[PDB]
TrEMBL record:
Keywords: Signal
Protein name: Cell wall protein
Full-protein interval shown: 26 to 186 of 190
Cystine pairings recorded for this chain: 97-153
Length: 157
């Protein structure tokens, strides 16, 4: 129970911090980079919690993990939409495009690591194909918005 609770609370914290990031992009007056950093470190803390499994988990664990992973699928589109709104304002700030680009790239890597940690865990083998499928689709979307934002921001800059 406590291992599984730590895992799922960590995944819920990731979704909370992602909503906080999307809000900061849309409504923020830097503080934006802080929001990306906090999301990154929530992902890292989820990796740590997944890696702390040392003992088989109960038979309801893989379905609870699937439920906690489900909201992640909506993150790239929400972030993409917010970034499109603020693109021109971000491009106006010296080094703005490059700071967002660097954070988008890192955020994609930290999500992919967390997905892979779950997908490749022997304690989560019963959902390996589902988690791997979600991982790849997250990656595709996360890459497309990263490359789209970078190319459009450079030009508006
Ligand atoms: Cl839980």
């Amino acid at each position: 129970d406590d291992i599984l609770l730590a895992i799922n609370q960590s995944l819920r914290l990731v979704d909370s911090r992602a909503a906080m990031l999307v809000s900061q992009v849309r409504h923020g007056a830097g503080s934006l980079a802080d929001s990306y950093h906090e999301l990154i470190f929530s992902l890292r803390g989820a990796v740590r919690a997944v890696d702390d499994v040392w003992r088989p988990l109960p038979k309801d664990a893989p379905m609870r993990i699937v439920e906690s992973l489900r909201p992640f699928q909506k993150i790239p589109a929400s972030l993409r939409s917010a970034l499109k709104e603020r693109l021109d304002a971000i491009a106006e700030r010296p080094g703005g495009c490059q700071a967002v680009d660097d954070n988008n790239r890192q955020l994609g890597l930290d999500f992919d690591r967390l997905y892979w940690e779950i997908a490749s865990s022997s304690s989560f083998s019963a959902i390996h194909e589902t988690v791997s499928s979600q991982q790849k689709q997250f990656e595709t979307a996360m890459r497309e918005l990263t490359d789209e934002f970078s190319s459009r921001c450079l030009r508006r800059a």
